[PDB]
XYZ file of N, CA and C in Angstrom:
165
model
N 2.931 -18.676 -1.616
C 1.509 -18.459 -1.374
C 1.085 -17.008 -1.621
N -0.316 -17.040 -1.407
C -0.587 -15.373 -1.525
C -0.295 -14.315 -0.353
N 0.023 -15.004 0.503
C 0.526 -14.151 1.727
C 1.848 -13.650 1.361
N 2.837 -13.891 1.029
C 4.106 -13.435 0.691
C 3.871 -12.578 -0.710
N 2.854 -13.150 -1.857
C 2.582 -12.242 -2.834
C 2.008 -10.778 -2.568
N 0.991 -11.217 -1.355
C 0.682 -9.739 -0.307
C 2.076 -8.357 0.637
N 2.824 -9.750 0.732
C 3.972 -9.149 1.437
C 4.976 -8.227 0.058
N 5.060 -8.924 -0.708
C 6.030 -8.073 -1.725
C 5.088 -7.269 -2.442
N 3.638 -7.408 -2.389
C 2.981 -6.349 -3.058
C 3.118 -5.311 -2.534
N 2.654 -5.431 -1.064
C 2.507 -4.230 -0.089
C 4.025 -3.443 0.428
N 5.151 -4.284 0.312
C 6.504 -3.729 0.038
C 6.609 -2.891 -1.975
N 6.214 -3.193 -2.181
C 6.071 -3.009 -3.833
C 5.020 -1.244 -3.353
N 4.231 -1.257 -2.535
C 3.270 -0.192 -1.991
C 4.256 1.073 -1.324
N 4.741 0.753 -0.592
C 5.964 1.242 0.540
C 6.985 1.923 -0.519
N 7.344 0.685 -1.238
C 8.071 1.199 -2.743
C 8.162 2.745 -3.843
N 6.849 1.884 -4.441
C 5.911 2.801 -5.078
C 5.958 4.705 -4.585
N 5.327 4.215 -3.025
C 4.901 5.648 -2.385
C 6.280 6.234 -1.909
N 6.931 5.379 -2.050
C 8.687 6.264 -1.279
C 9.100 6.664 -3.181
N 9.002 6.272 -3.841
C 9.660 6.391 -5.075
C 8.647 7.899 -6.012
N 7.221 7.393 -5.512
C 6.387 8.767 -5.719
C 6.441 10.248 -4.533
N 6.974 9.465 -3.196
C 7.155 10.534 -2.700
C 8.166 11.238 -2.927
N 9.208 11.036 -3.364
C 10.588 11.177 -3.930
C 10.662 12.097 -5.384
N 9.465 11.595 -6.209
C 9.018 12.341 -7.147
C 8.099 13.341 -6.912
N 7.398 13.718 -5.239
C 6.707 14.892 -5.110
C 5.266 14.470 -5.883
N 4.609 13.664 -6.112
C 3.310 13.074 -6.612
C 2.572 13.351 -5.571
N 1.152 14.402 -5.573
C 0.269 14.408 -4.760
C -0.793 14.309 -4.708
N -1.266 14.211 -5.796
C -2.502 13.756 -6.437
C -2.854 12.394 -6.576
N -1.693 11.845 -6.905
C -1.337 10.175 -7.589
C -1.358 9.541 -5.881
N -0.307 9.976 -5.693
C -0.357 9.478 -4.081
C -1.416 9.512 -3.068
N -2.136 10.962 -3.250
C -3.306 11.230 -2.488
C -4.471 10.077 -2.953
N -4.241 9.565 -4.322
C -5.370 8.678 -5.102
C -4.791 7.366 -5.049
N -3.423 6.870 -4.367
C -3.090 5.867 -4.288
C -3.775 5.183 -2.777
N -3.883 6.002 -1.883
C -4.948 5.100 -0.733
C -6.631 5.111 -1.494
N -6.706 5.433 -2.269
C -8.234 5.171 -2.561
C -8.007 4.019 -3.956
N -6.370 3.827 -4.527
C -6.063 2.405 -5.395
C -6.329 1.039 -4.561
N -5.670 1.201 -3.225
C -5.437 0.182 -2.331
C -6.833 0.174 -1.270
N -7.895 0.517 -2.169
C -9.618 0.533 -1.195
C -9.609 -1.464 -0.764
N -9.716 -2.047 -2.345
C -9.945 -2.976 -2.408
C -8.911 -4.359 -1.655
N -7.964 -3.996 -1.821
C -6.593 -4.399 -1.253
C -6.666 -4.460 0.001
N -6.898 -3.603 0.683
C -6.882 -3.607 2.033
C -7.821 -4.548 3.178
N -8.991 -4.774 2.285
C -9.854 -6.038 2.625
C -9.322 -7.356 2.208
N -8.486 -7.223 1.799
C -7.800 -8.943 1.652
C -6.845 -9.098 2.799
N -6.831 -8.579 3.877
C -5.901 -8.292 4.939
C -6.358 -8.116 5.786
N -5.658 -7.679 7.289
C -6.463 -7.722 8.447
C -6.211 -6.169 8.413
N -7.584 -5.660 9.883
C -7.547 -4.451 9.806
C -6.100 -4.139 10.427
N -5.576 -4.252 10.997
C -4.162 -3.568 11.739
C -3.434 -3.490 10.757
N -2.893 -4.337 9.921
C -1.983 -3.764 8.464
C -2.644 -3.014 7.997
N -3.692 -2.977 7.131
C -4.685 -2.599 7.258
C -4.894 -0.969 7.332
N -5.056 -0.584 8.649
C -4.775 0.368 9.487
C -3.664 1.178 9.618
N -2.414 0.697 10.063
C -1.427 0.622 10.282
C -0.570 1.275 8.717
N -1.070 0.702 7.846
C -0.937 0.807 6.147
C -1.491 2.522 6.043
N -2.219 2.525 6.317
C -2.934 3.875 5.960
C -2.698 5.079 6.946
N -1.953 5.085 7.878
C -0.992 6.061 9.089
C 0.262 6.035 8.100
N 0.560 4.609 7.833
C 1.771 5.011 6.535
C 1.632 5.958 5.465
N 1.266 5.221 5.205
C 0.740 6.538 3.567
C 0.574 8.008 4.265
């Protein structure tokens, strides 16, 4: 379903930002919570939320 496609996306996110943080990206990264604007409304606010204390 799309819930698990959400789940490995947003692990794919976690990914991404550990693999860019790793590469020192701060711009990209700083512009990657404003990639995931739209994304984040397909979800509840606490991931959501919770998602963006991550980053």
């Amino acid at each position: 379903n799309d819930e698990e496609a959400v789940q490995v996306k947003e692990q794919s996110i976690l990914e991404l930002g550990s693999l860019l943080a790793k590469t020192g990206q701060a711009a990209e990264l700083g512009g990657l919570l404003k990639y995931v604007r739209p994304f984040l409304n397909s979800i509840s606010k606490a991931k959501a939320a919770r998602l963006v204390r991550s980053l």
